[PDB]
């Protein structure tokens, strides 16, 4: 309605002297740990609850009803575990026995730590496609050749399958060791904020990119060709080109077996989809393309008439529990703390999706100590790093899940899955599993959709999607995400580092001021010229202050100074023979300024005592409380700039010039 | 006197419409492009008057006094330049000879493009140390062996004092051209913010680091012991190890000279830097302590009595130019950029103090040329990186110095010394020139003093120093300014990731808003809850965002909605047998943001959604014109989140929420 108010000009001290203060908070620290450690009851069992999330949800069950939706979700959830898991297991290099085996134990240990009711904890192909990469690096195929074969000129160095897997399955243990020890120490030293970040742009085109590297590893199983497991700068784009000179030997069998499949699990996924109103669960098109081909796999020989790529490597039973290899730490610290922070993005990113559906808070420090031990307890079984993919996670929620439950029944689909189920997959190609991984990259695929997006928007969160997508293409995957970091923190500094400096004017007959750069119709005091700089000055963006002060008011402060001097040497010469017209002075509207960086606060004095010397005062408009408290701290305020030159708002500055011209021409 | 004013409630939209915007203008690439470039012979003239600056200074010279005091300037300056260089060469592990090359060339090269009048350009120790350093990394001691000398087992490996020079002088002429490259594509590119990351407290760290680095190789020097040229991560700390194990393996006599010159220049410079109201120009310690040295060693045969170290290989003549081994680059790129910082750094410090105490003004982009021009012709002439040390600097600019004029001058001792002055040097100990440069340690060893002076200052400013003095010591020199930049940078984006929010209150019967934190008697609206959020929101402290919304209502929008929704259904099933009090609204004091990134306004948005469904408005008070701009790109006024929910004040927010309860019970 009527916004009118009438108060004296409180300026700095006019305001501080008859306000008084409140007192700070005593340090204490003696008794600051005191009060921090609670010794009372109900504390231990606040922290056993969150801890151990099981004691939340178990004694309110709902058995009534729950456990008919979570039998057929289990079963449901089982099959395409089973089946996700063993063809993610390609990605890393390991045998495929060993793909079951993440996705019956990770599912154990998520159960009485996680603090979710509708994720899938199992293998993921961007997680398993970094697992991959350091096994072919620290442990390649030209570097377990034997000798023996009674060749025909030179040694017989036929290729070594058999004992070559057990260093694989040796050095993948001990980095899914290493990656839960790392979300271990994120979780005990209560540090969550080291995820926040991977920004959208930054996990979007990160995934992006993963999604070509993914299509070129398995167009390799697909093909059936022999790359020399390149790694380094230009990864995927040496393997590439090899890709396409050994076309030649390839085999027709696998060729047109895999792209069938392909085409048919593409439909029914688009068709399922569109199709969502008339049928709710979701066709398991993984499962029936795989029972039918390993039912065509059978009949004929497909391993010895057509020479295709069959697995008939799984004993079908478990393994003694093998302690890590310790020591292999030093070459593979940096790779781990780039898994360790993905497989905690993905678990985030699809649990918070279906926690607002589903309308329950999930804890972010839990589920550091959730994985964390998942993937410890991993370790200590022959398996990868565990995350929660999402096409697996959606099969359990839209078939009808409510707890853990659901996924405890699917780990007993990939129980039977490993003492008996198995022996039936024998002659299943190989291109059939490494067919439903590409399948699943149309999500990741359809998110280069977003860069005309995001280009109408913040053409700097663009960039970095780019940036990412580029970089993790050109030098590996793991090294493009450390490399993403760095630029999107250094963003953010260029983004401070050059604010947006107006030219900030007064609208008549009101006390709302606006920049002259976006409204005509503004008129500025006589003589004032007022200044408004946002990102608070730091060390890097003081040298830019001066030159927004020097273009605001048109002179330079040091120039000026120097032509007097050297005009005033002329005049105590002609005794004994014989520029800063329209700035009278400058109100500062630093009111966006949060930090000082007393390191540049020491040039922020001598803009104050610059002006001073050619009769231009330096006047400030909207300097916070917190600011006024540390420019007191860095010895800013001496015998002659006192606080009486700092003011309140904006418009008690141009009210204290207008009144002193009037008071004292 | 009376601050009064009498508006309507303008929020966003009662004020954008009759306020006619201004229209911005085009881009017109062509137009821009074609305006950009000046065809006029006026710009020509500008940019070869600001190119080469020669031509300013020169006309307008003052002869008549001007000659003797750049001559007395220039002979004062070519011995401390000439002293000061085959001092410094013994840190570059080059000849004695080459250092008088670094202190002639440049100086020549510095005067038809320099645009600074008291900067003597010439060796530094610190570039020096790191120039030693890297060609100590590049060619170790161990890599010129030659056995020789029919030993008494073994073939007599002897060292190689001789043809090692040669390569030495390779890599370091190597070096120099690369640095010379990178700070001319550095003032080409008219990039010069990225010089502006180096902080004063990480300058002062760095300094105080290489100063440690050069009291541990010229007391090496003096001891006359010999190490191993230990590199890498804690390499003093193993060269000061090796030093104490080496103590019995000394030269009496040498040491007993180095301490004695020590202190004595010690007291010296002491004694005129306090006695400085009696005696202007200050007495050179350096000739006169180096002429009675030359001539006690002379005397007595201390090379062949005292078995002392002298240098004894000064030819005493000029070389022809050697063209660069280009190839060597990929290994020492950092290196060679960081020594270009470095040198820069000081350069742009050592110019703006002698500037601003002469008043002239210096630009930074010419300075950049000159210097890389400098380094160029330096590299094409046996020659080490150049800069102005601040002790020689002082020399000219006591004695008294007007033009460059002085400078060539003062590389006229130099010139005399190339070919004549220094076959009377050849008995001259070495330890008698690694004596000066550690007296000239005392600036940067009193650099230490201001750590308890910045922590009662910024704390996170006391930090990077101490942070980059220790990094700058565990892992080399060159690999501790990188790791003190990015760590700087890390510190600033931590400063606007954890923002200072608080619980914005109102004054009584005034307009201005406080901080409830700072101030007691303060009031709230009824049920109206002020925040304010500095350190504008990005991705990585959208969370922080949520958390401080969170603390600062009592109440989370998520839990309460769920636990509305929870006990929804009880209502729908009652039929058919048969928190959020306090909070009103949320005016958002969001006046210190400057971008968005709309990463986190998607983050707003779905804030603001939330709060709707809660029945709890969430209001904004000082959001400035560019971020609304943004806002309006970047997707957020839908049909339902309109403009009026944005306010120009925060006085108005509360006024309008004043007005609408009183209309609207």
């Known amino acids: 309605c009527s916004y009118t108010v009438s108060r004296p000009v409180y300026s700095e001290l006019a305001f501080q002297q008859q306000r008084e203060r409140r007192l700070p908070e005593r340090r204490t620290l003696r008794d600051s740990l005191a009060r921090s450690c609670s010794c009372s009851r109900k504390r231990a069992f606040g922290v056993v609850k969150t801890l151990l999330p099981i004691l939340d949800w178990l004694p309110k069950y709902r058995v009534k009803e729950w456990l008919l939706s979570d039998i057929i979700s289990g079963v449901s959830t089982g099959l395409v575990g089973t089946l996700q898991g063993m063809a993610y297991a390609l990605l890393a290099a390991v045998p495929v026995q060993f793909g079951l085996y993440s996705a019956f134990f990770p599912i154990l240990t998520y159960f009485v730590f996680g603090t979710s009711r509708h994720i899938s904890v199992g293998p993921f192909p961007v997680v398993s496609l970094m697992v991959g990469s350091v096994v072919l690096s620290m442990a390649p195929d030209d570097h377990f050749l034997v000798p023996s074969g009674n060749g025909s000129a030179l040694n017989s160095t036929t290729l070594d399958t058999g004992t070559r897997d057990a260093a694989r399955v040796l050095l993948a243990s001990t980095l899914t060791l290493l990656v839960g020890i790392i979300q271990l120490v994120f979780g005990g030293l209560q540090i969550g904020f080291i995820v926040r970040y991977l920004a959208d742009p930054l996990v979007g085109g990160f995934t992006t990119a993963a999604a070509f590297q993914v299509l070129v590893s398995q167009l390799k199983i697909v093909l059936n060709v022999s790359t020399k497991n390149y790694n380094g700068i230009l990864s ?136 964390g031990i998942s993937n410890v307890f991993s370790g200590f079984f022959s398996c990868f790093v565990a995350t929660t993919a999402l096409s697996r996670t959606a099969v359990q929620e839209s078939t009808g899940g409510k707890t853990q439950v659901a996924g405890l029944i699917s780990a007993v689909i990939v129980m039977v899955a490993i003492v008996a189920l198995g022996r039936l997959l024998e002659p299943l190609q190989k291109s059939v599993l490494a067919a439903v991984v590409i399948a699943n990259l149309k999500g990741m695929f359809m998110q280069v959709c977003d860069v005309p997006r995001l280009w109408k928007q913040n053409k700097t969160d663009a960039v970095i999607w780019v940036f990412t997508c580029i970089m993790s293409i050109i030098l590996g995957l793991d090294l493009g995400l450390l490399a993403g970091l760095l630029f999107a923190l250094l963003t953010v500094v260029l983004r401070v580092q050059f604010p947006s400096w107006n030219g900030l004017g007064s609208v008549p007959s009101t006390d709302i001021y606006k920049s002259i750069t976006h409204y005509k119709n503004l008129e500025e005091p006589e003589g004032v010229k007022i200044l408004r700089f946002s990102s608070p000055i730091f060390y890097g963006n003081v040298d830019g202050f001066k030159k927004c002060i020097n273009s605001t008011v048109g002179f330079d402060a040091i120039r000026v100074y120097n032509k007097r001097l050297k005009a005033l040497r002329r005049i105590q010469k002609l005794i004994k023979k014989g520029p800063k017209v329209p700035i009278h002075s400058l109100v500062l509207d630093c009111g966006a300024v949060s930090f000082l960086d007393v390191v540049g606060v020491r040039s922020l004095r001598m803009i104050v005592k610059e002006f ?34 700092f003011f309140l708002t904006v418009h008690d500055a141009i009210l204290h010039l207008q009144n002193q011209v009037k008071s004292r021409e």
């Open 612 to 645: 001073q010397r050619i009769d231009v005062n330096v006047y400030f408009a909207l300097l916070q409380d917190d600011v006024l408290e540390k420019m007191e701290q860095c010895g800013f305020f001496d015998d002659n700039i006192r606080k009486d030159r």
């Open 236 to 371: 995927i784009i040496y393997t590439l080109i090899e890709i396409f000179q050994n076309i030649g030997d390839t085999n027709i069998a696998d060729f047109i077996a895999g792209l069938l499949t392909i085409i048919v699990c593409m439909a029914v996924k688009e068709l399922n989809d569109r199709f969502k109103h008339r049928i709710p669960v979701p066709i398991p098109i993984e499962v029936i393309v795989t029972i039918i081909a390993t039912a065509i796999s059978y009949g004929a020989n497909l391993e010895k008439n057509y020479n295709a790529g069959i697995v008939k490597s799984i004993p079908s039973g478990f393994l003694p529990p093998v302690l890590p290899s310790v020591g292999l730490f030093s070459d593979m610290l940096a790779a781990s703390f780039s898994i360790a922070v993905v497989a905690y993005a993905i678990a985030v990113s699809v649990g918070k999706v279906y926690a607002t559906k589903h309308d329950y808070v999930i804890d972010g420090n839990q589920e550091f100590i959730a994985f």
